Every structure is written in structure tokens, then in C-alpha cells.
């Protein structure tokens, strides 16, 4: 776990899914999803998509272990939705690292 960087908090974005049922679900469940991401350092990556892919998997993983000690459970609708919001977040974290810092 000492190989990972941890980013500071961010506002979770609103994601749109193509149906009202999913849009309402997301917005009603989104507080259960992460608002910070885990990543590997930038100097290991050639391109943005590879960083985003790892950041996504690392972050989902830690979040699913942290919160099943809590006593949360995730449906598969929740893991798909985390996949989408965490991707966006990993993208923002990449832009923080490379432009803003």
C-alpha cells in the first residue's frame, strides 16, 4: 500500500446514464461512493488512459474493502456506477497532477 499515492478530496460529479431510473439511483446513492482516488505515481505512465485504468481499479478495490468492514454491501449496479464516477475522478486527478501542480 506504500506504493500508492492518495489524492485530496474532490466534489463527486453528477453522471448521466440514458434513463431516469439510473440517473435517480446514482444521485441517491452517490454519497456511498469515493470522493478521493488512489493512484500510482505519474512517472510510471506513458499516457493518460493507462493511468486512469489503474487508478480506477486501485480505488474501487480499496473502497470495497474499507466499506465491507463497515458493513456496507454493493450490488453490481453500484460497482458499474462507481466505475463511471471513479473514472471521471481519476481523470481529474490526472489533470491536477500534470497541469495544476
Amino acid at each position: 500500500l506504500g506504493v500508492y499515492m492518495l489524492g485530496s478530496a474532490m466534489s463527486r460529479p453528477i453522471i448521466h446514464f440514458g434513463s431516469d431510473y439510473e440517473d435517480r439511483y446514482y444521485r441517491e446513492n452517490m454519497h456511498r461512493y469515493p470522493n478521493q482516488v488512489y493512484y500510482r505515481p505519474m512517472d510510471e505512465y506513458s499516457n493518460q488512459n493507462n493511468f486512469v485504468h489503474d487508478c480506477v481499479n486501485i480505488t474501487i478495490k480499496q473502497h470495497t474493502v474499507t466499506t465491507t468492514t463497515k458493513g456496507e454491501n454493493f450490488t453490481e449496479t453500484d460497482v458499474k456506477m462507481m466505475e463511471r464516477v471513479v473514472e471521471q475522478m481519476c481523470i481529474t486527478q490526472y489533470e491536477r497532477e500534470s497541469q495544476a501542480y
Epitope: 448521466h16 439511483y25 446513492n29 454491501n73 450490488t75
Partner: antibody, heavy 116, light 107 residues
Framework: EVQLQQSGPELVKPGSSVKISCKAS????????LDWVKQSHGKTLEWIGN????????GYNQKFRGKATLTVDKSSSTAYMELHSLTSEDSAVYYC?????????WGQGTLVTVSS | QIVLTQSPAIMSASPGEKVTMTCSAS?????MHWYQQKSGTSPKRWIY???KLASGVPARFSGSGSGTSYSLTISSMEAEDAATYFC?????????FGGGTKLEIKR
């Protein structure tokens, strides 16, 4: 093939409370949403709150906080609405409504009459 | 509390007529839903996600709209369609309904 059965009509005294049930039968959805809606005197519809019965999550209309409490017995697929401290304006027909993407089912409603 | 306003409140139409009723939002919603309720029965979802017909809803119904203006159309009014129609939004808490259009048929 899924159906919602609600409990029967209640006559309650003002000041008391009541609890109504909505049981989902022959259901096979993992994560669906259950809304509760009130109808007063044959017309006006108001949303009270919702529960996702398969893990935890519960929403309220501000106007009904302190008045409704939503819970679920997910062993028997039954969802409950507690109504606290009733008065005459709580006399109404109460509905549970199931939603899962395209699919929607409404219960036949529970008539609550608040009277001495 | 997005307010939904439906007009007209009462409407009469002849068999065969094209009927349109409108639901207007005080702010933008992405999607609108419509319910039918006849006397004695509980509301039933009629159109969802603005233009999709629920199961067992006849083809002569259609929905459209964007932003703050949404409508429900019946291309050919039939006696069975006499009822009250409500719109409803899930854009933000609290989810609200319109006050209904009551549709009657001339005979």
C-alpha cells in the same frame, strides 16, 4: 408477474400512530426502488419517501420528516411505512410503488381515516 | 421543489379527435413521466422517460418535450381513455406531481 400487496384500511385516533405494509410477491429483481405516495381527497399526489429494499438507502420529502418513517424487512420482502402522531390532514390513501427501469407496479392503496 | 403545472385542468374531446395536454415545469427536468388514474383504481405509469409507453398502454399515445415543456398526445380519442392524467418528475428531491388533467369524452 410481480405484484404489490398493501395492508387493509385503518381507523386511527388523532394523536396515535399506525404502520402500513407493502409486500412485494413473486419478485425477482435485485435492486429496485420503492416510492411511497399519498393521495388526499381523490386528487392531489405527494411523494413521501423511498427505500431501496436490498441494501439500506432511504429518502424523505422534507415535508414528511418527523411524520413518516420508512423501513424494510428484507427477509419477507415487506416494506413499512410508520406514520407518527396523526391528525385529520393525514387521512388519505397511501400507495407504494415499485420501479425497476421500464417496470413499474403500484399497490392498490391503503385508506387511513383519522378520527375519534 | 420543481412545481408542475398541467393544462388544461378539464378537457372534453370527441371520439376520434387528436388530444394534447401539457405539463410545464418551473425549472428544467431531463425526463418526464405520466400516470393514468381512472375512478377507483390506483395510478399506473403510462409514459416514462418522456416518450416511452409502459406495458399495455395503447399505441395511440405519445409523449414529448424538453426543458420545461412536456406534452402527452392521443392521436385518436377513445372512450376508454376518459380518465385523469398526471405528470411527475424525478429531477430533484422532493419529487412532485402535477395537479392532473381530467379528460372526458363527448357523446
Amino acid at each position: 408477474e410481480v405484484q404489490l400487496q398493501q395492508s387493509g384500511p385503518e381507523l386511527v385516533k388523532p394523536g396515535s400512530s399506525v404502520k402500513i405494509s407493502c409486500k412485494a410477491s413473486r419478485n425477482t429483481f435485485t435492486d429496485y426502488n420503492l416510492d411511497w405516495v399519498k393521495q388526499s381527497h381523490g386528487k392531489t399526489l405527494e411523494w413521501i419517501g423511498n427505500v431501496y429494499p436490498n441494501n439500506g438507502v432511504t429518502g424523505y420529502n422534507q415535508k414528511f420528516r418527523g411524520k413518516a418513517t420508512l423501513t424494510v424487512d428484507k427477509s419477507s420482502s415487506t416494506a413499512y411505512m410508520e406514520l407518527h402522531s396523526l391528525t385529520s390532514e393525514d387521512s388519505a390513501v397511501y400507495y407504494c410503488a415499485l420501479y425497476y427501469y421500464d417496470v413499474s407496479y403500484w399497490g392498490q392503496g391503503t385508506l387511513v381515516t383519522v378520527s375519534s | 421543489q420543481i412545481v408542475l403545472t398541467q393544462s388544461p385542468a378539464i378537457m372534453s374531446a370527441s371520439p376520434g379527435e387528436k388530444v394534447t395536454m401539457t405539463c410545464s415545469a418551473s425549472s428544467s427536468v431531463s425526463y418526464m413521466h405520466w400516470y393514468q388514474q381512472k375512478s377507483g383504481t390506483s395510478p399506473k405509469r403510462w409514459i416514462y422517460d418522456t416518450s416511452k409507453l409502459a406495458s399495455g398502454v395503447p399505441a395511440r399515445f405519445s409523449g414529448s418535450g424538453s426543458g420545461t415543456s412536456y406534452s402527452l398526445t392521443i392521436s385518436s380519442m377513445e372512450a376508454e381513455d376518459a380518465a385523469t392524467y398526471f405528470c411527475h418528475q424525478w429531477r430533484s428531491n422532493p419529487y412532485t406531481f402535477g395537479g392532473g388533467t381530467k379528460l372526458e369524452i363527448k357523446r
